[PDB]
Design a protein around this ligand. Sequence first.
Ligand SMILES: [Mg+2]
Lengths: 505, 519, 521, 502
Amino acid sequence: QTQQLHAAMADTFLEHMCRLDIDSPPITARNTGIICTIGPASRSVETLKEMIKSGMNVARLNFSHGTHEYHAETIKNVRTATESFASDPILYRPVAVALDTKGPEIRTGEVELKKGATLKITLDNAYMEKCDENILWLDYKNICKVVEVGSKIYVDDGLISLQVDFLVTEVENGGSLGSKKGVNLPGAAVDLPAVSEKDIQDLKFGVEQDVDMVFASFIRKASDVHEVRKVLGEKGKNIKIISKIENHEGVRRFDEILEASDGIMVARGDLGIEIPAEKVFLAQKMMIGRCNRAGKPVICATQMLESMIKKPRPTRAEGSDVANAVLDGADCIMLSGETAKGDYPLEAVRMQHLIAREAEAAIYHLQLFEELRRLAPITSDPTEATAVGAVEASFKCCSGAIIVLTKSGRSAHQVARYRPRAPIIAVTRNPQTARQAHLYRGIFPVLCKDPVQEAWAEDVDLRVNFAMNVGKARGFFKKGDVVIVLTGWRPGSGFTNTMRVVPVP
Amino acid sequence: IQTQQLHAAMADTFLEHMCRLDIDSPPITARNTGIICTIGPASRSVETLKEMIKSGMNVARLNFSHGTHEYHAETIKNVRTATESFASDPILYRPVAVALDTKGPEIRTGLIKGSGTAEVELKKGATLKITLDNAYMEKCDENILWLDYKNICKVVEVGSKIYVDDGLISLQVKQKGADFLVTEVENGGSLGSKKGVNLPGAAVDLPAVSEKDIQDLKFGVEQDVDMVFASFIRKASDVHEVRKVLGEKGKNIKIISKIENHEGVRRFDEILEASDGIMVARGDLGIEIPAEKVFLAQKMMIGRCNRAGKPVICATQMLESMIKKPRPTRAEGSDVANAVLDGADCIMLSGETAKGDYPLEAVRMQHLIAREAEAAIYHLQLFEELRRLAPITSDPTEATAVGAVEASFKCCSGAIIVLTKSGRSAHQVARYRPRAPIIAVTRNPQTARQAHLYRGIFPVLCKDPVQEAWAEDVDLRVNFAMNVGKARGFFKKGDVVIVLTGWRPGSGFTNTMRVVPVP
Amino acid sequence: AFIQTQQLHAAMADTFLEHMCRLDIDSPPITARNTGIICTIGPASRSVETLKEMIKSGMNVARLNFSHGTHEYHAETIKNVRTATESFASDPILYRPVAVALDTKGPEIRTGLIKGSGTAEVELKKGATLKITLDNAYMEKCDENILWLDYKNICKVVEVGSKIYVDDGLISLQVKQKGADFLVTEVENGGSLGSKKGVNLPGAAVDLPAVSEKDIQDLKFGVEQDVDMVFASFIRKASDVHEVRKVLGEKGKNIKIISKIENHEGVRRFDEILEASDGIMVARGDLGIEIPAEKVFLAQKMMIGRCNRAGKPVICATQMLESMIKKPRPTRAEGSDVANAVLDGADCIMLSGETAKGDYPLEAVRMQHLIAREAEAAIYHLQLFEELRRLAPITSDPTEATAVGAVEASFKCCSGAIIVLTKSGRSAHQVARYRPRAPIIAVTRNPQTARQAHLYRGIFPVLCKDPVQEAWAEDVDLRVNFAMNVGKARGFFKKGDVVIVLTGWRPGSGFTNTMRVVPVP
Amino acid sequence: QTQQLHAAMADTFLEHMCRLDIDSPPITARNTGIICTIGPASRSVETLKEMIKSGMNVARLNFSHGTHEYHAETIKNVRTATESFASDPILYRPVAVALDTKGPEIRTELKKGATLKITLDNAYMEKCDENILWLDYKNICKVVEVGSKIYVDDGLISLQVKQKDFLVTEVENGGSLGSKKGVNLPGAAVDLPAVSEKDIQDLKFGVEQDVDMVFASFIRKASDVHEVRKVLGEKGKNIKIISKIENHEGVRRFDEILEASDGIMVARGDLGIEIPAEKVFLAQKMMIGRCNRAGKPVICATQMLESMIKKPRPTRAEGSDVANAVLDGADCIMLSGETAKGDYPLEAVRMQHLIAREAEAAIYHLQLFEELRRLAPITSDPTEATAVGAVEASFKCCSGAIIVLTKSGRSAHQVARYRPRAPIIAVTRNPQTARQAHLYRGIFPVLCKDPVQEAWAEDVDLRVNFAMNVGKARGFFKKGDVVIVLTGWRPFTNTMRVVPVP
Ligand SMILES: [Mg+2]
């Protein structure tokens, strides 16, 4: 009757769908990470404390606008709000900090432009500030090499459409053309740098500010990721790089970007400008599918609950979109304007928590785990065999949680790629590991502050008891319930090889 | 192959099918999911209705929550004018259905300060006076508000939530009276005129078919509507009531039950058994039950209708932002695609086409997304699952239908041509969800109109007289469908198509399947 | 109570493990028996009297073994098979076409006569010495000390330590001294040594030709005697199949070549052999001496699977009911082997000594008919059809789409039959490839088509004797009505039942595109 | 390349068959138990030693013939040959002893069409003539109706009841009718006692002689199993009861029998006489499937290599039968007259070892494990969750073994139920647990003879390193290979460790 368990048992996907019950309450735990873009409507400490209580797991800093002093104050407020709950480690919720780069752009130098008018695209810098309905200037000097006869040029976020030292185009879709407008070249392999000079400064600032992850704009190839990783350097070697896929090139060359990256962001907003909007769902389902196949985190972003910027309730499409991103297999869901500038940021966070939790119970785990189990490679890695063994055992006994002791998070990540129904309580002493764990579906990172015991067995048993107390206090399970515990054979990362099926004391 | 997501189609698992979805894999011309457009001030001119049909409109929905019989009668006349302007060519004529959506048991507010456009911005925490006095029915303000539910105080109690204007305004009950309610504005906002009111935790004792619904159903029978979308169906006896109201003269009108509340979801199975189809009416359903649970109700209803072989329509706020913007949000593109993937036979446009600034853009967008989503369907597991529902039937027409769908997959058929009197033979094929479009040739124009309720059916209306030799009449109808597929870009000469015919005239005799090349 | 019959409860199971759990001894099978029975004809079954009873008991193909006997001997056998077959031609409703198959001798190694006699036997004891000679003065003078064989290149292919197997590999010898014209051996396993016994050299690389001059004359004799098929012995490569195909020539181009996989090389080069051949025989007798006996079931499942995947006939052969040579009832292992061969996917099952020289040849044919009928209902068609469907999911051939639609329609209505009008047999073979549960009643006017239909599982061929009717719709209806009367009288279905009918849109072969779901009149 | 691993990775059963390769060698481990009926041809200590070397796991004693003194001397010789190898626990193979009871029996020229009269009056008890037939089953007319079939002497003669303290039959299939022959009543609910008078003494003797299991003959209902269980009593509470299904009623009431029993024997001999021989495979596949579903031992028996009683090589049907029983899911395969009275007993055992080892590699483990898990209930048992988690991990790392420390055998049986490809090395200090482990597919029982170390961690590591030494010595694995180890964690098997073999 609870957690969609009747639909969980179904032999077919059709019968699974038929049994979905609105009167089958979900469990307490919400596995999907919620990333909130911080802005005017949420950057105070008082609002941030409420965002954390509502469900925020990651604070996203949009570096498209704002100064370094502005972003440092936002980060400072995020940490003050986060540490206001640090007195109780049993209830403490780690909150990660993410840096979203601006990236390279193509800008124009108000007229009207009509369907059928002739428009010449010039590169000569004399008409840099003399743009009109006959001549238009752009700052991307390599455009004629990347463009061809028939190619389309989009101006002002796809509001204007054109068709090809200079270019001769015909206006397909018109509108009011203003100044310093963004340009997009659908299907073109653009040679803009992986990181602009501003991106270099912003990435170095993120290292100084101790950020957990970087959402790298306009990633088109593996070498773009490699450039970001070099700018982060030794000091930022542990910062996760999430590559944003925003154009045809990034979609077509997805597999090399995924291998080079720590994770992926389906940047639907920019992707929907470059590619036909009716195709974005294909790119979303393809990338979520491949990231789940590779065990790499995937973020679904843009306009998930857009109407909540002005309204306290989302539309029916918006509720459906959050649910379907979770059903697809997205590790995280994102709020942009909804939390940055909207009138109901707290309501937006709470809505994402409610939909995500409902959706996680409606996942067809029976076929999901069979397929992941089948497509899993046969290897000699003991941690990989332990992790699959733990997820298999967690389904057999319907455990309250899978408790994992982890230093770097890898052990908890290896369990998360198998998509257990049971929450993964990852106990760590590393605060960055705790913050970064939010990028992986199903991980509840708990930061142990107790000092290291001299008897290693006692230190392990201490951390297992901490996970039991966290699970009991947070309503995940109670005394007598069955849980799975993962530990290793010696201290240090890389030794997780032990699985126990144990009752809660 | 690099088209229609045929590489994804070949996957052995659902995970690999998702991994293979390709943005560079173009779909076939045909679009299977029906598009229902609510007709209104923005789209009721003949000029706009012609462009609506060219953009994709299959069904014209007339919402009886607003407007008089004269207004709706003119809209229906304009729909028929737009539709018949293409009748000079039977090879390119697209049948258009007319749907009457009932008002149902609605609770509504009055007019703000005498005008239907004036708005009073309510604030959070402010006290409000709900009145049942006909004097304040047109002088509604930020302090006093009139509604038309008279039995409100007996069904509602202190502490209950009262929702106003698509649930966007919340009012908690503090005090009650004979002709009044004292509430606290939990969620404030601009309160306009003639807005809907909801009471989710209430035993609303309103009638199944109200005096206005009786009048509207009668007007629908005189106007020859194809289908009724019955608002707020709570149980099977509500469906039977609408069926008895329509009587003999409305016996052929299809009844689509709208599921908009908890009781409807709970008693779904009996409602489905009595109805001709279902509408997941997400608008009210999202206020009546927690909004985070609407997707569960949606998928449960689409799954159960697909299992029972009955049409299901996904409705409300699919492309809502397109009322003001020419492009939808990413959530809106996703919702439409996901409804098609779930298995919805039809998708609906409400304010987007009835009152918005971009009605044709919304229709075209719904067409573009549906066709992309249809190719993305994992037909391999879907057909495998539908075949196992009733693995052994004694019906020879059912055996013929599944054999034709099996053959259509085998030869990646351009179409399944079906000769049908009542629509049944085409409906029987549509229940198996073939990738190939179904060209249903009929001489019954009501059948051609109603066919749009079933996913994949392209009704074509043969106008030629009945030939004396029945074999020549069959070959005349089959040749007309070949002409339709060619002119509409579904297939070309040489292509392989499936043909379903009977052994004698009349319904229920479809037993012949032929794999024939296009002449 | 329909589900209580033909294992339909087990058929409806969502898992193979649940399908096994639902297998019911009280669920009676249909009258139809899809797997073809091939009987080797010999002294116990050579008479017209016993051959009529073979046909009544279930024999579909008469196999003539060319390892023994002259052309004169095999001409009389073919005559008696055609006599017993045509003794039922008077009533076409009950006539059952019987095919004739010629099994070549091939590169075989045989011993000579024991003491000048064909029936004489001697006792070989364990550890004793046995000299193998190539000297023709001992050809009809073999005994416990000296054994002669016809393979003149034996000393060059074997060495000290080599194992030589005699008489179905029951007698084993180990080479202790290799001589200039002889081999001194030690009897590893002894027993009764008879005359003209087969010899196997598993280690050795025997250089005998694939198509010897005897095989060229035997194949040419088969063309003259209008045989339906050839069982080509010891096929090791595609070029061997092409040699048999060349000897048969244009005059015997419609005769089917079934390649017998009997050694390691045949198994290794299996894929090229299968593409070049019309069918495969899993010749377990020689294969289980050439390769370790415990690996034979691996080759059997591999070959049946690949033939089902390729849409080509596959026969399972040798020792299926071996104890029935001396006993009226089989062992439990024999009952299990016949059932598991049908469960694996073999189109045909075979009988060697059980019908060629045994004391109960009719009881052996009847037992194969009873077990195959039970194993056929027990097939898990749900997963089988799904896997077969996924092999070539997109085709341009309209008849391939028609065939698959007819099989899908036959499962939906659990039809009593799939009636197929066919000239060449292609349309019936296309249906049989999808493995329906329903028996395929193939109506044809071609007698060779009718006999060759037995190579494919489920095809019940009926020979139409009526002349071609003037109106083509009237000719189709006459042949459909003939199948209706065949099924009715044979117990496959009754009036009111639903059957699937496959016909063409125009006269001639290659136009089967019409499927009708009709009730039995 | 080895172990049919190309075929193992196939997406479909059809692709899996296509990939079976005769050149793909199996691992040295052979998972299926081999039960050998010991008789005049195999009861000498020296022959028994060779039978153990050839692969015998269980010595079966057919109590249908032979005195208690004869059978106890066979048991003495089996233990003598078994214990000759005890001086090396790394190579020592435990050997179980089974007692097969005789069971309740019905005892007595004909022509097809003749009128034969069955009489119940003891007047014709000594007059065994071909005109009237006497049976010693007094309730014969109450269990057979008009139209029923009566089989005489292993189903050589069949009769049909036409009239009904007497029966007027018509001989359906005739033959030569002798005296003191066996009688079988197809499809009848015979009310013969669950255990006859000799069976009780035989079962008592079994307990006296410390037998590991009993194959209870002619089990028709659950109460029959309960009757055997009562006779064995408190002294025989650990002896496993394997019910032999030999007739229609046993096949029909199989679910109630399996639940009451410790395991099942598919006694194809008698079953083939009671039901049509062409249906015996349906009953075998049903019983193996239900036993696999229930996690209870199933033994396939009778005529598996029958020709090997006189010949050194088996027929193709026999080689096929053994492989197909292993592929179906039989935990054990049996040899009757092939090892008890045949001329090639060692060759019969060696052939079963070779066929089974090839057939275990040919198992389509991918779909098997998926279906066992789908059909498995969501229990809160921690040992079941650990067992299933160990089997999943063993497939993921293709481990050389699942090492299980067990006292009673339960935790090794729980792993066996999920049919891992890897051998299950069960380390025990209980000699009866070591012997009985042979009933469960994939368990190689190793009897640790070392004293219990005072430090618990050192005791667990002695038992684990013993399994490591056993594995290397037997060829199951080498240094560096990954193994799965199941232990208790604290001084209730609930811990799984993935470790390289040292
Ligand atoms: Mg509504």
